[PDB]
Amino acid sequence: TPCLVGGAHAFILKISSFCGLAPLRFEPRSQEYAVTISKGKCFYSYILVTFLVICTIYGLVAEIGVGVEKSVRMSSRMSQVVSACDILVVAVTAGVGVYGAPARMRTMLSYMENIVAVDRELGRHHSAATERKLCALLLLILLSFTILLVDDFCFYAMQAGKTGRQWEIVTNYAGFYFLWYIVMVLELQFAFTALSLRARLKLFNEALNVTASQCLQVPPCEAVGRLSRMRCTLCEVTRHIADGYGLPLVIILMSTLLHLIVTPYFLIMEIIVSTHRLHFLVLQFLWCTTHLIRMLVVVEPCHYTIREGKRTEDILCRLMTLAPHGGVLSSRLEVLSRLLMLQNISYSPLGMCTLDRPLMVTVLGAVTTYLVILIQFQR
Amino acid sequence: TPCLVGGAHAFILKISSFCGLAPLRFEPRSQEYAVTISKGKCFYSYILVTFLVICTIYGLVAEIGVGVEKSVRMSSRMSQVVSACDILVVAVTAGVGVYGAPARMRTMLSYMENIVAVDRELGRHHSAATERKLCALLLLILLSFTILLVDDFCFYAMQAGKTGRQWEIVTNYAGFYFLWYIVMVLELQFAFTALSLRARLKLFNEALNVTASQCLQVPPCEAVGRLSRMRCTLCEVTRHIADGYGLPLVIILMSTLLHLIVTPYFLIMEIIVSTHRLHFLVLQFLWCTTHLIRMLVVVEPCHYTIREGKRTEDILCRLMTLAPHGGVLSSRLEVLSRLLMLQNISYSPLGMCTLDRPLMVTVLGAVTTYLVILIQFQR
Amino acid sequence: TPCLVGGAHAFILKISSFCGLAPLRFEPRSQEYAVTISKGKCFYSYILVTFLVICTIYGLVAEIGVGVEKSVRMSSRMSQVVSACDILVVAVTAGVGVYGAPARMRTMLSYMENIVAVDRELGRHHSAATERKLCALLLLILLSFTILLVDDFCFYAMQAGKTGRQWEIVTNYAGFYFLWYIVMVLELQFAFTALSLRARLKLFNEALNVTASQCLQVPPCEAVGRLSRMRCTLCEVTRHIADGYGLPLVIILMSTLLHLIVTPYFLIMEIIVSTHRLHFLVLQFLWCTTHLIRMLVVVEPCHYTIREGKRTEDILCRLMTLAPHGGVLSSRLEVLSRLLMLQNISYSPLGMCTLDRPLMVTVLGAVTTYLVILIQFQR
Amino acid sequence: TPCLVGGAHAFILKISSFCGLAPLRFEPRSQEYAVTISKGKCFYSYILVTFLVICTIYGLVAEIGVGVEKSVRMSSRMSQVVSACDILVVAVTAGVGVYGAPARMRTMLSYMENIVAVDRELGRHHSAATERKLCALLLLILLSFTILLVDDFCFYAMQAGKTGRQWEIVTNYAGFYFLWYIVMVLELQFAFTALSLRARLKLFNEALNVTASQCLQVPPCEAVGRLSRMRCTLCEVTRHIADGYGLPLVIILMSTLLHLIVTPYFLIMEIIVSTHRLHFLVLQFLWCTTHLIRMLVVVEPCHYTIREGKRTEDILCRLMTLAPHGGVLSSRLEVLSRLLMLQNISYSPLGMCTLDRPLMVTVLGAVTTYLVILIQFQR
Numbered sequence A, B, C, D: 001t002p003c004l005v006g007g008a009h010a011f012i013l014k015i016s017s018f019c020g021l022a023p024l025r026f027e028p029r030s031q032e033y034a035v036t037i038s039k040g041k042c043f044y045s046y047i048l049v050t051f052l053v054i055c056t057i058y059g060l061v062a063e064i065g066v067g068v069e070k071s072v073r074m075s076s077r078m079s080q081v082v083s084a085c086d087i088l089v090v091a092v093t094a095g096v097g098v099y100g101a102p103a104r105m106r107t108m109l110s111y112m113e114n115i116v117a118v119d120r121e122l123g124r125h126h127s128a129a130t131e132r133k134l135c136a137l138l139l140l141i142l143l144s145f146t147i148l149l150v151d152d153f154c155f156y157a158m159q160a161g162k163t164g165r166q167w168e169i170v171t172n173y174a175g176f177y178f179l180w181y182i183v184m185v186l187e188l189q190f191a192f193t194a195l196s197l198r199a200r201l202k203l204f205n206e207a208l209n210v211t212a213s214q215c216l217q218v219p220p221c222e223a224v225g226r227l228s229r230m231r232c233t234l235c236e237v238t239r240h241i242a243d244g245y246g247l248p249l250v251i252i253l254m255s256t257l258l259h260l261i262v263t264p265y266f267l268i269m270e271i272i273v274s275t276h277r278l279h280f281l282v283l284q285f286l287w288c289t290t291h292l293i294r295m296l297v298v299v300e301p302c303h304y305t306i307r308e309g310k311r312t313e314d315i316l317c318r319l320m321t322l323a324p325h326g327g328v329l330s331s332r333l334e335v336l337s338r339l340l341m342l343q344n345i346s347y348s349p350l351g352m353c354t355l356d357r358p359l360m361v362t363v364l365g366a367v368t369t370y371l372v373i374l375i376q377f378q379r
């Protein structure tokens, strides 16, 4: 019983495999891809992430020990704790992403066999078309992030080359940007998994709307029960996704919080002390935009899933109003109403957050408060 | 199938059309008004808002570049970021109001054909009388805001005339007050749309109260089902209104937050440094009152709609208690109870906020915190 | 159809009538008291509150104008805004309590005729005994508050007598303590109304527990329907109480917030600048305790009502589990379950707050934040 | 009708009895332990806690009065209010734990007779095995905390021995660490009671999953009703546990808040003024970790219970989808669905908090805000 997969989870799964976030074999059997746990590639992922974290920590220690005057990035005693936190938070995020990738892939393989059964009753062509449309956004975001990483690395290398520390700065911050790449790939992987589930739930909503209200290929009485079972399976898959990614999700959220606190602090420091390096200002603005984009990538698929659940409730209420009174197609909708009341399809990472648009407002308020706190502490 | 409309959406729709927030043709067919998308007036609205935003940005740049000593409004380096934010937030609010007006009018025309069907089963005379009562408040609020705008503009013009910059200040801040007018008209338009829907839902509540409990013109068994379908249509219209105005609503909320942070800062600065211009103090107090009134205009209709939904729940519970046990008028109320449990009628702009009275407390607390933060930063 | 009343609303209603918070006639007909609107006593209440507010404002103006050095209470420029806010917040609270007393008494008379019908099906002796037990707490709290008011007034009078301003200070702060008395009486009136409704709902819970589970005087099938109607009436009375007292409740909550922000500020100022007047420290500690007691008086009855509602849910779940399957006493409990799901018995003043124990934590956190803000501003 | 108990509540109940948190007799009848109220041991617990609190307060007073220069712990005027709060908060926590232990043991004995009936229908061997697995964690945490207490006490004793105040410091802080031991034992007692109830509810979930979906020993129709009654009893036990421990829970939560505010302040003070005592830094880091562990011990069992309730909802939805339409095993699941909708199994201490993972985020944010407030106040 191989776990066939294709479309979105055929390209980003290979990218994550290359960067160590998806230790899966990729047998080319059939048109789709048969994925399975690849013990031996998990060891490679662990070795890669451990080497990157060790190199990043050693480079951070060397950059702290080289001195405030000599360092080009840490040109202040206060601009050493913030940069150290910046480095360590992405190190922790990449570690959580890789140290836990085998378990996440095991859960993914577990719910593959259920989501394929769900797709068979809806049409795999629609899911394949929707998943192939997310590859363009995947490539665009990955290319933008990689270009920003390369530009930042080159800028700092040329700045350190003036004082004859270009190779030292390259050695110290080589693994930092690889950890950035790993973190971004993990975020995109979660986002596209959630978007695939959202596409499945949208297909479920369309089927519930068009079949339960009289194109049909089935009586609506049996159709409502089939859709109820399908929604239970979809809720199971949503819970598995939320459980697998919960720790990476909370770590990514706190990393975005810390980064939206730190980067504006650096921009303000530059515009108040130097106003000299326009490249630094451009990079700081790009990094603030990138952190906002990361937050959006994390929170938007979950909000869309919640909106699709609300649409499910809307469709079900309309169907119950249009349903014949006291007929067979009135107790089948009662069971679905009880299901909708008992269960909501939402992403709660580790039970702390809710992963919705209201979470963005709270994080932005905390960012503003901690930013003004740092500004007061600097002065 | 023309979208007939009249009463509230016959006067403020013409005002919004004049200011570019409602690109609709206004054929005088029948007693009411037949509205439709008016491609060619949407182009006029886009040109108008683009010209206003360009003029406002150019005037802001000129006022920043004229110097702290020369400028009469920006008489401080710190009183340049706050004034720039003040200008740009209303520029963004007006842009969002106009760049998106055709789509909002399309959604409005979409739910017109449903809300007229809802009104036909309740009585168009009541809705026309209720909508005509909102025109007096519309005229009062618009006149008050326009008088305040004219007074502020004249005050600043006379202040700049002392240093020979009256025409310069007029050129720099001509479009700023037009953007204020557009923002206020957009707020009033949303408020009166929400109030019209609240009036419809109040009529629905009265019908549910008087018909399901034995003036009738219909058996209560069929009446409960008809009212359930009506409530589903009303929920659909509420969702369309919330989706159309969601981005303008969140932009208006953040603009009110920023303005309630900024205006008391200016008032405190004046009372601590000058205590000379009584006109400035009067204007600052009037502007604080106006921002509070704007917040109330935004949040009160949604709170009233939520209160009407709670009244619907109350009436339904009373009806279920009074209903005969095991009769036909017991499962019809079960469907309505399930509908009420699954669906609540509330305005959630873009999914972030909830647009209720509790939102006022949070915004006021944030206003106080950021205001004391600015006061600390000034000293 | 006179509105007979006795017990709790026979003593505190006379106290509130004396202080202008209950303009009701008190015909001694029957053992209980027949209350009705007393137009002519409402005029007396309005005149009394207007005179008190005018005297308080004039005294505040005179105390501000007498000078920082001459004033014994306002011995600082910063300790003039806080004291002015302290005075004006209780002035506003007393005004809201009295300007609105006739409408609150009208709503009270409206729900008297329903709550007496509720009591007749439960036993008026229990309600009379429970309401008579609240009179001891009423007298204790009123006596404690009056003693504190008299002690504070005497302390300030003797302090001003040293500089020959005892009669001036008496004239300036005569009405301030009368406004305190009015505010405290209003708080106690709301608290005891809510406690009476809580006692009624507790009787309802006991009846539901002992009658629906087989002392009975009625079959349980009809008993469940009677209790459902009773709970609907109790929810109506709760909503009327919340609507009548909502504005006084929110004003009292913000007054307690401001006072818990102000009084510790005065205590800290004294312990850092003088450490001389032990009477002042004792009074400040007593006032902090009094503000906490006021907060508890406001929030505890609502929390107890919510707890009684949760107990209702618990009892109903136990009854449904113990009920025969498919019998007549299974759909009667279904209606009650739907009623409990649709309606919760809670006090939401004007829709902003929730009036529960969690509200205490938020208010205390805001108190701490604003207190440390004032401490930072002083230094 | 003795209350037989064993496993977890056979070892920690003896530990709590020794430290005064469980005044119960421990007759060795049968394999398990028969516990009952032990009037005479409650007097011993009261005497012990009163003596400890009096000694702690006297030692705190002596340490404040010995002088800033002489004291080794309070080497600052500002580092006297924070240390006094540190001491008094654990004194209050231990007092609440012991002053209230007889009532908590009475409630525990009350719900013992219900939870044993619940266990009999599930299998006492599973509960005994699960409860015996918590003893290893109990011993580990108690040993770690005792080792930390002894190390801290010895460190401070040797530090005071340099200035010839080792016996004085021992006398002053002897009871402080005993109060710490009592607080930790109370936290572990609550945690293991909650974990035992979680194990019972997990057994209930497994039985509902395997029996209602066709190993059985009973038809599923009667099984669903039996499980509904069992869940009602489990909710009753959860409510009794939450009511008994509510005040200790809120006191422990505020103590953890205050300690996570205070300990990082001491660590920062040391790293900014001395950087000399590495033992002090190690102890401060260990104490921060211990306070975080205490918070986790408090909040994790409740979160696991809520997760088990969500799993109950999931299982019930799956069963309703798989249940035959219109059969007997469709209305039995309707009653259970109504039970799940009306009741959630959660720990709300005194009604203020919710005791979940989201509570950790709020407390951590408050910790950060108050910590930076103290840092600003120090400078």
Ligand SMILES: OC[C@H]1O[C@](O)(CO)[C@@H](O)[C@@H]1O
Residues within 6 Å of the ligand: A086, A152, A259, A262, A263, A266, A284, A287, A288
């Ligand atoms: O300048 C601050 C920005 O730079 C980075 O450290 C990457 O080099 C980002 O983590 C941060 O947002």
Ligand SMILES: OC[C@H]1O[C@](O)(CO)[C@@H](O)[C@@H]1O
Residues within 6 Å of the ligand: B086, B152, B259, B262, B263, B266, B284, B287, B288
């Ligand atoms: O003085 C501040 C006030 O002035 C305005 O800029 C209008 O001229 C408002 O935006 C603001 O509330």
Ligand SMILES: OC[C@H]1O[C@](O)(CO)[C@@H](O)[C@@H]1O
Residues within 6 Å of the ligand: C086, C152, C259, C262, C263, C266, C284, C287, C288
């Ligand atoms: O000292 C402050 C205290 O004194 C009062 O003004 C009463 O005289 C209270 O409002 C306040 O809590």
Ligand SMILES: OC[C@H]1O[C@](O)(CO)[C@@H](O)[C@@H]1O
Residues within 6 Å of the ligand: D086, D152, D259, D262, D263, D266, D284, D287, D288
């Ligand atoms: O140093 C601060 C730490 O020390 C203690 O007082 C114990 O001696 C703890 O309460 C606190 O976390």
